[PDB]
Design a protein around this nucleic acid. Structure first.
Ligand SMILES: [Mg+2]
Ligand SMILES: [Mg+2]
Ligand SMILES: [Mg+2]
Ligand SMILES: [Mg+2]
Ligand SMILES: [Mg+2]
Ligand SMILES: [Mg+2]
Ligand SMILES: [Mg+2]
Ligand SMILES: [Mg+2]
Ligand SMILES: [Mg+2]
Ligand SMILES: [Mg+2]
Ligand SMILES: [Mg+2]
Ligand SMILES: [Mg+2]
Ligand SMILES: [Mg+2]
Ligand SMILES: [Mg+2]
Ligand SMILES: [Mg+2]
Ligand SMILES: [Mg+2]
Ligand SMILES: [Mg+2]
Lengths: 66, 118, 104, 116, 70
RNA sequence: GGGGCUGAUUCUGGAUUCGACGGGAUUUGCGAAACCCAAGGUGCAUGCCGAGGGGCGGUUGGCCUCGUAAAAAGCCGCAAAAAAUAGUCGC
RNA sequence: AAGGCGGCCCCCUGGACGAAGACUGACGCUCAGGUGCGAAAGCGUGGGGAGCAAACAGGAUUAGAUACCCUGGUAGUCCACGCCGUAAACGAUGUCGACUUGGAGGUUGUGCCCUUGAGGCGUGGCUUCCGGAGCUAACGCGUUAAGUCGACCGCCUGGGGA
């Protein structure tokens, strides 16, 4: 039930920060495909989007850090 | 009309109650579209009296995607004060898997015939 | 050419120099006979973490088609311009036209 | 002295010893007490009872600044991750945040060799 | 794992919530895993042995339950 | 530039999402805190006091009981979909 | 291709695979000698040097302990140039190619069909597990063969001595 195959999105943007906040977790980590259910290709493009947002400080590296 | 294809590969059903939801008329222009879902229609019954979970509101989205009715809505079911004590005692211990069997009408609402799939 | 995508953050006290950055980088791109497709000022935004002891930042997005020499000139002027803290230049295959997902 | 209101707790539970340190909000450590000083040495101080009586010694140490609020930052693995803040509940200052500040490197410096 | 307290929530409940949250977010597991340097061959070999036992139990429960035993 | 198609139920029509979850209301029939009412059933007794209890914590301002000093009742989380503990031996 | 490769971005760049077409028309395969790449440790020159850490010192346990365990700690690890050419360099399985019952998944395309919702019907490539006839000394390998074959190359002839 991968939402990327359920909404047909071709290339995952890295600025839909709410839809990336769905796939980061309470500490700032990345929830794996065993918990979401994403196909692995969109999981890797998701991980690249999370890394670009984390470098751009849209998302946090860790929920603790300051 | 609709049908789910998650457990459509999977098992059959032991119990039938005429437990339809009272789905509101904020979604008539997506009801008469054709894009079917009764997806992930697992219902859990509790002190909230048969909350269904996560009803995907038909992403045709003619209402400019802000609020059609809900992104995902929880809703209850139309059964007796005795049938929702029987099914209450049946459901409220184990986290069961129930599902709708169709999506049709009796000229007023979208009728759901529920059932547990062991 | 290519389709470079430049998104960069500016120091919040230098937020009124930023339209000058828009004009100067637009002119330094268009002078090389190279197009420029979309351009947004997101405004100030609170950060997830303090970048260089600083908690608000001014986001600017643009999507450029330009040759690689003037893109790298833009990159070294980003590195030697003090007002910009971070700046990402990502090479995309296709040039965009539409609106960003954050502005809506 | 300066009888401040809020404090922060620091529980550095490690694999052998468990240290409790009430600091202020700003960073100055007001008082502290250790499970190794609280009446043990060697084998005993890697048990959470030692951590809870360390927190009791620390409650003695700062039952005079007027501490009426206290957020707890636990750190590290080991015995006194839970029973230390159980003892701080027994001491009775109010707890708002229970945060975990364990230093997790993102594959940084090489850890030492594996003990045979 | 910064966890607040909420009003009308006793501290045994708040500490249980912090406990389960830190446990599933993986602080204890990761400090025990990053204490000593598990050499890269032992990393790959422990991963292969874990995958073998994972697949072996998840196949062998059917391969043992396909009959009667009582 | 007019006409037909979406005011969903061939309209002289009565819930019919049988009964949802919460209603403002009425005859019926049965609890004493639903009740006028006994000494109508029944006597060392009564209303209001105070205080304590399942490996651990929480919960009934109350389930149970007691009177110049400390005891027995009803319910939840405490991992079972991959998981928690040990120096000394040479021939 | 093998060694190997793990945050993100740019520049240069090789290879694979898929689709409909088009094209050259045996241009193919293997390869002694020959060459190139070849983990780690090691060496040379010059930098760096936080962690870790052979050598070394101290503490213990011990009968002794030149070891495990503890406290330190220099080479080295690292960067650029080179040199060495070795590993249980492992799938202990040379390359290429053909044919031979199936199932379970993963991965990456792609055709069609109403993608009528997160489907369904096929074809490719790559990849892990179970297993059939066959084979095998047995274990087991089993359409990625250790099956049935073909082409070319390498290598072995008892254990030590080596
Ligand atoms: Mg150590
Ligand atoms: Mg002898
Ligand atoms: Mg020809
Ligand atoms: Mg040769
Ligand atoms: Mg080397
Ligand atoms: Mg050297
Ligand atoms: Mg030497
Ligand atoms: Mg040197
Ligand atoms: Mg040093
Ligand atoms: Mg050799
Ligand atoms: Mg190897
Ligand atoms: Mg190998
Ligand atoms: Mg060999
Ligand atoms: Mg043979
Ligand atoms: Mg086999
Ligand atoms: Mg053969
Ligand atoms: Mg053989």
């Amino acid at each position: 039930f991968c939402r990327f195959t359920a909404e047909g999105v071709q290339e995952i943007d890295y600025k839909d920060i709410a839809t990336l906040k769905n796939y980061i977790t309470e500490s700032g980590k990345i929830v794996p495909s065993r918990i979401t259910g994403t196909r692995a290709k969109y999981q890797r493009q998701l991980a690249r989007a999370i890394k670009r947002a984390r470098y751009l400080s849209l998302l946090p590296y860790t929920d603790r850090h300051q | 009309i609709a049908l789910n294809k998650r457990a459509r590969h999977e098992y059959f059903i032991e119990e039938e109650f005429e437990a339809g939801l009272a789905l509101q008329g904020w979604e008539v222009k997506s009801l008469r579209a054709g894009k079917a879902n009764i997806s992930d229609s697992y219902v859990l019954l509790r002190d909230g009296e048969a909350f269904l979970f996560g009803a995907n509101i038909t992403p045709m989205a003619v209402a400019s995607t802000h609020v059609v009715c809900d992104p995902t809505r929880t809703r209850k079911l139309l059964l007796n004060q005795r049938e929702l004590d029987s099914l209450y005692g049946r459901v409220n211990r184990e986290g069961y898997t129930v599902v709708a069997l169709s999506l049709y009408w009796k000229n007023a609402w979208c009728k759901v015939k529920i059932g547990v799939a062991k | 050419m290519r389709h470079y995508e430049i998104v960069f953050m500016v120091h919040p006290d230098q937020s009124e120099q930023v339209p000058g950055m828009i004009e100067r980088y637009t002119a330094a791109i268009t002078g090389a006979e190279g197009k420029i497709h979309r351009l947004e000022d997101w405004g100030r935004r609170q950060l997830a973490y303090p970048i260089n002891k600083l908690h608000k930042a001014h986001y600017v997005l643009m999507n450029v088609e330009a040759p690689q020499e003037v893109i790298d000139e833009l990159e070294t002027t980003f590195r030697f311009n003090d007002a910009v803290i971070r700046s990402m230049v990502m090479r995309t295959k296709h040039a965009v036209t539409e609106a960003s997902p954050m502005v809506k | 002295r300066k009888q401040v209101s809020d404090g922060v707790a620091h529980i550095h539970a490690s694999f052998n010893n468990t240290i409790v340190t009430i600091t202020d909000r700003q960073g100055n450590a007001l008082g502290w007490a250790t499970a190794g000083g609280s009446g043990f040495r060697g084998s005993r101080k890697s048990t959470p009872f030692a951590a809870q009586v360390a927190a009791e010694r620390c409650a003695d140490a700062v039952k005079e600044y007027g501490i009426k609020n206290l957020e707890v930052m636990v750190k590290g693995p080991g015995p006194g991750r839970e029973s230390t803040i159980r003892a701080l509940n027994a001491a009775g200052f109010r707890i708002t945040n229970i945060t975990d500040v364990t230093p997790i490197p993102h594959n940084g410096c090489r850890p030492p060799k594996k003990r045979r | 794992p910064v966890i607040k307290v909420r009003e009308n929530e006793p501290f045994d409940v708040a500490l249980r919530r912090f406990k389960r949250s830190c446990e599933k977010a993986g602080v204890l597991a990761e400090v025990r895993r990053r204490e000593f340097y598990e050499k890269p061959t032992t990393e790959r070999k422990r991963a292969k042995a874990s995958a073998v036992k994972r697949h072996a139990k998840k196949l062998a429960r059917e391969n043992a339950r396909r009959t009667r035993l009582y």
